[PDB]
Design a protein around this motif. Structure first.
Motif, PDB file in Angstrom:
ATOM      1  N   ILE A  10       0.861  -1.182   0.000  1.00 56.21           N
ATOM      2  CA  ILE A  10       0.000   0.000   0.000  1.00 56.21           C
ATOM      3  C   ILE A  10       0.892   1.224   0.000  1.00 56.21           C
ATOM      4  N   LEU A  11       0.912   1.947  -1.109  1.00 56.02           N
ATOM      5  CA  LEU A  11       1.784   3.110  -1.233  1.00 56.02           C
ATOM      6  C   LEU A  11       1.047   4.445  -1.364  1.00 56.02           C
ATOM      7  N   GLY A  12       1.774   5.546  -1.181  1.00 57.70           N
ATOM      8  CA  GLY A  12       1.150   6.846  -1.318  1.00 57.70           C
ATOM      9  C   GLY A  12       1.714   7.929  -0.427  1.00 57.70           C
ATOM     10  N   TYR A  13       1.299   9.162  -0.707  1.00 59.30           N
ATOM     11  CA  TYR A  13       1.734  10.325   0.055  1.00 59.30           C
ATOM     12  C   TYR A  13       1.315  10.234   1.527  1.00 59.30           C
ATOM     13  N   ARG A  14       2.125  10.796   2.419  1.00 59.96           N
ATOM     14  CA  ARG A  14       1.833  10.746   3.848  1.00 59.96           C
ATOM     15  C   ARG A  14       0.508  11.349   4.276  1.00 59.96           C
ATOM     16  N   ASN A  78       2.406  -9.042  -5.142  1.00 64.33           N
ATOM     17  CA  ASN A  78       1.406  -9.379  -6.139  1.00 64.33           C
ATOM     18  C   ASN A  78       0.475  -8.267  -6.553  1.00 64.33           C
ATOM     19  N   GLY A  79       0.352  -7.231  -5.733  1.00 61.95           N
ATOM     20  CA  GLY A  79      -0.543  -6.143  -6.090  1.00 61.95           C
ATOM     21  C   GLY A  79      -0.291  -4.857  -5.342  1.00 61.95           C
ATOM     22  N   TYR A  80      -0.518  -3.739  -6.015  1.00 62.88           N
ATOM     23  CA  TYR A  80      -0.281  -2.448  -5.401  1.00 62.88           C
ATOM     24  C   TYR A  80      -1.525  -1.624  -5.260  1.00 62.88           C
ATOM     25  N   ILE A  81      -1.652  -0.977  -4.113  1.00 65.71           N
ATOM     26  CA  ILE A  81      -2.764  -0.086  -3.872  1.00 65.71           C
ATOM     27  C   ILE A  81      -2.123   1.291  -3.739  1.00 65.71           C
ATOM     28  N   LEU A  82      -2.333   2.155  -4.729  1.00 63.17           N
ATOM     29  CA  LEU A  82      -1.788   3.515  -4.681  1.00 63.17           C
ATOM     30  C   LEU A  82      -2.918   4.430  -4.224  1.00 63.17           C
ATOM     31  N   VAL A  83      -2.846   4.906  -2.984  1.00 63.25           N
ATOM     32  CA  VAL A  83      -3.899   5.758  -2.447  1.00 63.25           C
ATOM     33  C   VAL A  83      -3.503   7.214  -2.223  1.00 63.25           C
ATOM     34  N   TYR A  84      -4.476   8.111  -2.378  1.00 68.06           N
ATOM     35  CA  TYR A  84      -4.278   9.550  -2.180  1.00 68.06           C
ATOM     36  C   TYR A  84      -5.498  10.114  -1.451  1.00 68.06           C
ATOM     37  N   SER A  85      -5.406  11.360  -0.989  1.00 68.51           N
ATOM     38  CA  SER A  85      -6.517  11.987  -0.272  1.00 68.51           C
ATOM     39  C   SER A  85      -7.230  13.056  -1.090  1.00 68.51           C
ATOM     40  N   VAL A  86      -8.552  12.945  -1.181  1.00 71.70           N
ATOM     41  CA  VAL A  86      -9.352  13.898  -1.947  1.00 71.70           C
ATOM     42  C   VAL A  86      -9.440  15.266  -1.274  1.00 71.70           C
ATOM     43  N   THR A  87      -8.712  15.432  -0.174  1.00 75.57           N
ATOM     44  CA  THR A  87      -8.696  16.702   0.540  1.00 75.57           C
ATOM     45  C   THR A  87      -7.325  17.327   0.354  1.00 75.57           C
ATOM     46  N   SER A  88      -6.497  16.672  -0.460  1.00 76.23           N
ATOM     47  CA  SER A  88      -5.142  17.138  -0.739  1.00 76.23           C
ATOM     48  C   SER A  88      -4.738  17.085  -2.220  1.00 76.23           C
ATOM     49  N   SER A  91      -1.324  15.151  -2.405  1.00 76.86           N
ATOM     50  CA  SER A  91      -1.258  13.694  -2.416  1.00 76.86           C
ATOM     51  C   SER A  91      -1.492  13.174  -3.833  1.00 76.86           C
ATOM     52  N   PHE A  92      -2.395  13.828  -4.555  1.00 77.31           N
ATOM     53  CA  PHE A  92      -2.721  13.450  -5.916  1.00 77.31           C
ATOM     54  C   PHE A  92      -1.514  13.656  -6.825  1.00 77.31           C
ATOM     55  N   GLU A  93      -0.818  14.778  -6.670  1.00 82.50           N
ATOM     56  CA  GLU A  93       0.354  15.043  -7.499  1.00 82.50           C
ATOM     57  C   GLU A  93       1.445  14.014  -7.213  1.00 82.50           C
ATOM     58  N   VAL A  94       1.698  13.774  -5.923  1.00 83.10           N
ATOM     59  CA  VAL A  94       2.717  12.816  -5.494  1.00 83.10           C
ATOM     60  C   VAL A  94       2.417  11.391  -5.955  1.00 83.10           C
ATOM     61  N   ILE A  95       1.149  10.998  -5.944  1.00 77.64           N
ATOM     62  CA  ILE A  95       0.811   9.652  -6.368  1.00 77.64           C
ATOM     63  C   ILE A  95       1.228   9.430  -7.822  1.00 77.64           C
ATOM     64  N   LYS A  96       1.080  10.450  -8.667  1.00 80.29           N
ATOM     65  CA  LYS A  96       1.469  10.319 -10.072  1.00 80.29           C
ATOM     66  C   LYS A  96       2.958   9.997 -10.168  1.00 80.29           C
ATOM     67  N   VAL A  97       3.754  10.605  -9.290  1.00 82.94           N
ATOM     68  CA  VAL A  97       5.193  10.372  -9.280  1.00 82.94           C
ATOM     69  C   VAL A  97       5.512   8.953  -8.808  1.00 82.94           C
ATOM     70  N   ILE A  98       4.947   8.563  -7.668  1.00 83.73           N
ATOM     71  CA  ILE A  98       5.170   7.234  -7.112  1.00 83.73           C
ATOM     72  C   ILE A  98       4.747   6.165  -8.111  1.00 83.73           C
ATOM     73  N   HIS A  99       3.705   6.447  -8.892  1.00 87.67           N
ATOM     74  CA  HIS A  99       3.234   5.483  -9.887  1.00 87.67           C
ATOM     75  C   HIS A  99       4.295   5.258 -10.963  1.00 87.67           C
TER      76      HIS A  99
END
Ligand code: GTP
Ligand code: MG
Length: 171
Positions: A10-14, A78-88, A91-99
């Motif tokens: 499970i990955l993503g911005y803090r 086996n699988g990745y969950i890339l999560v971000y916060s709809v209040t940030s 987090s959305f910008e960072v997730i694109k990078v981590i992806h």
């Protein structure tokens, strides 16, 4: 096989709620405090379409646009969950990078990615729309979903979906 074992990262911005989302699914309750995560690992059972699983979830430490993507999350997952916060918007910008970093390291391999928009409940401070998260998830050909660590059902569906997307590539 009565039981299959799949490891999920499970990955993503803090502070997006990777832990909360995971805790909700495993333990069943919403932890309201905030303790940054170094790395926790839960092993829970879950049935998806009659197949029981021995899901091993790796709840990782928040990452940002500059942090280097860790190699042990690069192999044998086996699988990745890339999560971000709809209040940030961050987090959305960072997730694109981590992806992108994730795809690089994983090489030319069919690894199932799933994008999740968390904090669906915080209506007053929603800064990203549903349609924008969807578009992204579509640019990645990844199953998209929004969720709330407080709405247990939405938390269970996130992990249920990753399994669903897993079995798809296997077959
Ligand atoms: N209202 C609301 N708060 C949430 C939700 N999900 C998480 N939170 C809160 O967001 C804060 C951070 O949640 P965490 O689960 O620690 O986020 P995290 O990504 O694990 O944090 P890091 O390990 O540093 O990456 C906490 O106060 C959580 O309770 C949600 O769905 N709704
Ligand atoms: Mg945490």
């Amino acid at each position: 096989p009565q039981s299959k074992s799949r490891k999920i990262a499970i990955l993503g911005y803090r502070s997006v709620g990777k832990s909360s989302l995971t805790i909700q699914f495993v333990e069943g309750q919403f932890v309201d405090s905030y303790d940054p995560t170094i790395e926790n690992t839960f092993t829970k059972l879950i049935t998806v379409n009659g197949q029981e699983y021995h899901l091993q979830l790796v709840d990782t430490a928040g990452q940002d646009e500059y942090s280097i993507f860790p190699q042990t999350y690069s192999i044998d997952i086996n699988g990745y969950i890339l999560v971000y916060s709809v209040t940030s918007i961050k987090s959305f910008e960072v997730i694109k990078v981590i992806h992108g970093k994730l795809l690089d390291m994983v090489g030319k391999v069919q690894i199932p990615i799933m994008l999740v928009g968390n904090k669906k409940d915080l209506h007053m401070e929603r800064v990203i729309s549903y349609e924008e998260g969807k578009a992204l998830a579509e640019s990645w050909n990844a199953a998209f979903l929004e969720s709330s660590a407080k709405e247990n059902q939405t938390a269970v569906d996130v992990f249920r979906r990753i399994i669903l997307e897993a079995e798809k590539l296997e077959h």
